[PDB]
């Protein structure tokens, strides 16, 4: 009955998307110089993981980082002097994501145990113990990010997202509307919005304060595995299993540029930006990472050296180094 | 060296003590056998957990004949199986358990789909996976007593028209066994370990121990390079 009305609304939305595309990002950005060949060298090589690295997250002071392995270990790395700061044992070894606090006090971890564990680092006792456990999801917890000390947004495999309250232990906002498993999560720099990518080949922009969706982006042909905002808080890049990256914009409400190459058939695990947003780093399944020019779609650099699939990819806050974590149990720091 | 300050030397010493504890835990994590417990709740799996013992993964730790088994039950997932099946690449063996007596029971959904054919397509989707090419599968055909009491009333031809034998127990059970064993496309590196449940103390555990013994022998032959 109202399916025809929904189809008419989709007609109006994509007609507006066609009407807003009066130009092309490839045509306007012809007046800029190319970046050339980016040559980056491994400065540090972190060793001591005996399992498959699935996630990392940089610290707010651009020196410490966290690492999540499948032997039940969260290791806090001092990236300058290769030291191990903390080795947190995990109650469940099946951990697919981890996060670090903007104040440096807490560490989140989650996975197939459907529980978001929040750990306190600055305890008076001297050891890192379990502070909170958020057991409110019925699907696998795929990503989690810290809005604040007392707030966390989690994305799970039950096609929903959640805004929590840490000191209480219950969720404050439930985000529903996805028809696929939400795989990746990225917060805005001003921490007012976020965007989530799911297995239904669509990325949805959510609202923290109101609690409902605002924009929905299509264009992908397969499952979306990675997402990351452009550092101004207005655009974001998505990575799929179609061996293509896509640059979506919130104000134009359409895609901008597709990042693809002909011999690459393998999916994207993790995307990230630099501090200026000129370089887009994306780790693939061909044992490598690639540094694309985010304004010219040129393959500006190749980061090789991992023996297995590069799972996680992080760029620090000041833009100095790039950490790459792979399934060969080595974290490699590039500069 | 002498370049480091008084606190950085103690930080390096703390890092070395942490790395020693990490390798001492990694040896114990590598000296244990992981078992991925697949199947469905309608087939009967918690009874096999209770026989072997005596909210997304149920971890069961048990020791038999000085071998530590960690069994991971993933039946509580309500999502797509593809996005988390790649985590179990380093598992030693799959234990897959389906019921015989559900040969004629229809599924809970409104569609007329047999539970036995849903189990065979699930076994075909799991067995023909790129992550589990060198992973052995231990098949448990459950509810033999109920299947024996039920096959005397209903024929096997209602399931699939291929069966042309008699309505006896042993021939039909062996034919269901070979129909499950025909789904293996990769017959070179993978072997299917089909075993009817005995429902007796130290029988299924003994079979799983012998299967894990054969897989550890194959892994040791790969580690030697003799294989």
């Amino acid at each position: 009955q109202l399916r025809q009305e929904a189809e008419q609304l989709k007609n109006q939305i994509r007609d507006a998307r066609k009407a807003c595309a009066d130009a092309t990002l490839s045509q306007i950005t012809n007046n800029i110089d190319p970046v050339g060949r980016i040559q980056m060298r491994t400065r540090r090589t972190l060793r001591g993981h005996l399992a498959k690295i699935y996630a990392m997250h940089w610290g707010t002071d651009s020196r410490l980082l966290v690492s999540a392995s499948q032997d039940g270990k969260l290791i806090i790395w001092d990236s300058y002097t290769t030291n191990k700061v903390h080795a947190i044992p995990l109650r469940s070894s099946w951990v697919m994501t981890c996060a670090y606090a903007p104040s440096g006090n807490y560490v989140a971890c989650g996975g197939l145990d459907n529980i978001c564990s929040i750990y306190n680092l600055k305890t008076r006792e001297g050891n890192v113990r379990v502070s909170r456990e958020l057991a409110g999801h019925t699907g696998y917890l795929s990503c989690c990010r810290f809005l604040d000390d007392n707030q966390i947004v989690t994305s799970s495999g039950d096609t929903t997202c959640a805004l929590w309250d840490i000191e209480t232990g219950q969720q404050t906002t439930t985000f529903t509307g996805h028809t696929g498993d939400v795989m990746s999560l990225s917060l805005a720099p001003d921490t007012r919005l976020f965007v989530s990518g799911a297995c239904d080949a669509s990325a949805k922009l959510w609202d923290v304060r109101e609690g409902m969706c605002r924009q929905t982006f299509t264009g992908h042909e397969s499952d979306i595995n990675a997402i990351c905002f452009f550092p101004n808080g207005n655009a974001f890049a998505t990575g799929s299993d179609d061996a293509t990256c896509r640059l979506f914009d919130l104000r134009a409400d359409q895609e901008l540029m597709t990042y693809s190459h002909d011999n690459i058939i393998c999916g994207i695990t993790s995307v990230s930006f630099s501090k200026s947003g000129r370089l887009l780093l994306a780790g693939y399944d061909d044992f490598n990472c690639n540094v694309w020019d985010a304004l010219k779609a040129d393959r500006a650099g190749v980061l090789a050296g991992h023996d297995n699939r590069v799972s996680c990819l992080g760029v620090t806050d000041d833009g100095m180094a790039v950490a790459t974590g792979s399934w060969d149990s080595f974290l490699k720091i590039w500069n | 060296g002498c370049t480091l300050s008084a606190e950085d030397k103690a930080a390096v010493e703390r890092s070395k003590m942490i790395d020693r504890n990490l390798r001492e835990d990694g040896e114990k994590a590598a000296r244990e056998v992981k078992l991925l417990l697949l199947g469905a709740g309608e087939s009967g799996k918690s009874t096999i957990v209770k026989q072997m013992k005596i909210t997304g993964i149920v971890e069961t730790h048990f020791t038999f004949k000085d071998l530590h088994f960690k069994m991971f039950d993933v039946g509580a997932q309500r999502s797509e199986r593809k996005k988390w099946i790649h985590c179990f690449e380093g598992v030693t063996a799959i234990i897959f358990c389906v019921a015989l007596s559900d040969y004629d029971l229809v599924l809970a959904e409104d569609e007329e789909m047999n539970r036995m054919h849903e189990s065979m397509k699930l076994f075909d989707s799991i067995c023909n996976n790129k992550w589990f090419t060198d992973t052995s599968i231990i098949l448990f055909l459950n509810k033999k007593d109920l299947f024996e009491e039920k096959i005397k009333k209903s024929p096997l031809t209602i399931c699939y028209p291929e069966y042309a034998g008699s309505n006896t127990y042993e021939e039909a059970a062996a034919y269901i066994q070979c129909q499950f064993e025909d789904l293996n496309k990769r017959k070179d590196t993978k072997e299917i370990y089909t075993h009817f449940t005995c429902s007796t103390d130290t029988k299924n555990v003994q079979f799983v121990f012998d299967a894990v013994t054969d897989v550890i022998i194959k892994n040791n032959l790969k580690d030697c390079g003799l294989f």
Partner: single-chain antibody
Amino acid sequence: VQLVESGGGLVQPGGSRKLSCSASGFAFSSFGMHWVRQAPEKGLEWVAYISSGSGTIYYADTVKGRFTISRDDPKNTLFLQMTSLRSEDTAMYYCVRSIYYYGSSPFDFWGQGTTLTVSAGSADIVMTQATSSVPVTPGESVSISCRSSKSLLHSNGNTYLYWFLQRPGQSPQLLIYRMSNLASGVPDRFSGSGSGTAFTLTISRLEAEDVGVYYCMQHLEYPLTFGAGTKLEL
């Protein structure tokens, strides 16, 4: 979190005595332990230090050979075997915990203190304070300076100057670690600064609780030489 040490008392001159510190309320196995002595009329003085896991052991230059440090992690007990102690060793002994990583705050918690009463160095960085007694009033801003014999700035960027407040009749506590970071439980009244040679400690809107003796400390190299102590008075 508590460190209670015992074993002191009247000792015959030339004898021996073993001390024991019971640690409870924290992770004992991951902390390096210190011993600090204090003369009844002079300042504090470092004695020894054992690391986490009994790996690295440091002694002071005036107690080497006589004293012996040992720890027991299942019993959570730190021992101190003293042999052939002389007339100088009559002092008040403190037990200190310390953890060392990026962002750590060592010398944070201090023992209650035990007494010892017997019946009676050019390479070290000498710490010297410019004054010994400053008459203060509650409600003003008071600054106290210091002087070091060697530049405490290291090539990594840190500066190993720690500040301590010993109230009369109580144990000392940590105020400022690394000269730019406040310890936990310390108000925002205390503030520290330095130039790598001359250091300053400023106190805005001072209160009557802040009276006591201020000790500085260098941690650039072992042994740990302590300041003379600036006593405040009302």
